[PDB]
Amino acid sequence: TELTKCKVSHAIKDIDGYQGISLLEWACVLFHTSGYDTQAVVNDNGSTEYGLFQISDRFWCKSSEFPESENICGISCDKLLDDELDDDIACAKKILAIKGIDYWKAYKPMCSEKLEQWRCEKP
């Protein structure tokens, strides 16, 4: 499902400030990463990225296309293609703790300025 900026911000509140990344920055990163589509599926090649966070099967989730994956998040990549973001968030936190915000390539070029536009004012 294609979510809205506020739907996302409300859904991922628990990640605010984690590893120093704010909600504004996450709202920005996720828009550019998956357009807020929880069912986004994209390749580079030889590997595939899933969901809102575009979590890759190369090292993070296990996919049928690459069952030998390290599967660091301990999860089927299909669990990253639905509207329940709790498991996507736990996996993203692992990536953040292990690799860092740099996993998300849109952060630097797109989310280094004009962060205020990403604010959600809906209680």
Partner: protein, 272 residues
């Protein structure tokens, strides 16, 4: 005859845009007797200072073009523009290169006429209000500001995709658009970067005047998101000097002059 008024008296404001009834380009021609071979139109009433080449990147989107032409020709004539329509068709089946095709359009359109304004438009976006003039302004113009696919709201302030217009001088100023963005996304952000590096800001109509309809469609093969887009967008400052109008190379395979547009099929190479 004298200069056209700053605002056109023929404008009707909001319009109902739907893709239900199939389009017949033949009827479209009938309904637009004043458009000349190659999709050229020049006001007979007054003199327009806007010599606009409308450039559309294209490949296997003939059905969308029909709707585009069906709606835009009436609109552009109402906007009193001295315009020409150019559909740059990418031959072959390599990754789509939108920005490179837009550069081809710029150079090719200039062979036909002394254009001073270039509108670059996706083949599937139709403006819903004719007050959203398809022409150039003092600053680069972002036209499709309120797309129904984005909830009729600009996705982000630095967004420059969809439909935009650069005067000839603004375009020359940034060395045109990049030729190295293959596959989907990022090229519009690189263009935004280029404009900003040259000290320009983005001019836009408000979100009501800028309402735009998108023709929903399945994604095309050969235009999958570009894996290098974010890394490329972060280096525009340096690559814009060496990748643009000045490094553009392509081969023309065919030029078609139809009554509603000029379609140039080109071989623009492959990712290198």
């Amino acid at each position: 005859l004298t200069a056209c008024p700053e605002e056109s008296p023929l404008l009707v404001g909001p319009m109902l845009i739907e893709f239900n009834i199939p389009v017949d380009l033949k009827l479209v021609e009938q309904q637009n007797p004043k458009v000349k071979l190659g999709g050229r139109y020049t006001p007979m009433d007054c003199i327009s200072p806007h010599k606009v080449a409308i450039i559309i990147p294209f490949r296997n989107r003939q059905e969308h073009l029909k709707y585009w032409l069906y709606y835009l020709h009436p609109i552009l004539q109402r906007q009193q523009l001295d315009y020409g329509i150019y559909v740059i068709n990418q031959a072959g089946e390599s990754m789509f290169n939108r920005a490179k095709l837009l550069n081809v359009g710029f150079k090719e359109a200039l062979k036909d006429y002394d254009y001073n304004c270039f509108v670059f438009s996706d083949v599937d976006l139709i403006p819903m209000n004719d007050h959203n003039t398809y022409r150039c302004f003092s600053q680069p113009r972002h036209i499709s500001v309120a797309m129904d696919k984005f909830g009729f709201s600009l996705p982000y302030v630095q967004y420059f995709g969809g439909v935009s217009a650069l005067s000839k001088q603004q375009f020359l100023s940034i060395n045109g658009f990049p030729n190295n963005y293959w596959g989907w996304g990022g090229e519009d952000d690189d263009i935004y970067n280029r404009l900003a590096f040259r000290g320009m800001s983005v001019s836009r109509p408000n979100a009501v005047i800028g309402k735009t309809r998108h023709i929903r469609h399945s994604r095309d093969k050969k235009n999958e998101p570009n894996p290098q887009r974010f890394d490329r967008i972060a280096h525009t400052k340096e690559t814009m000097l060496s990748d643009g109008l000045n490094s553009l190379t392509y081969m023309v395979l065919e030029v078609q002059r139809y009554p509603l547009y000029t379609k140039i099929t080109v071989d623009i190479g492959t990712p290198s």
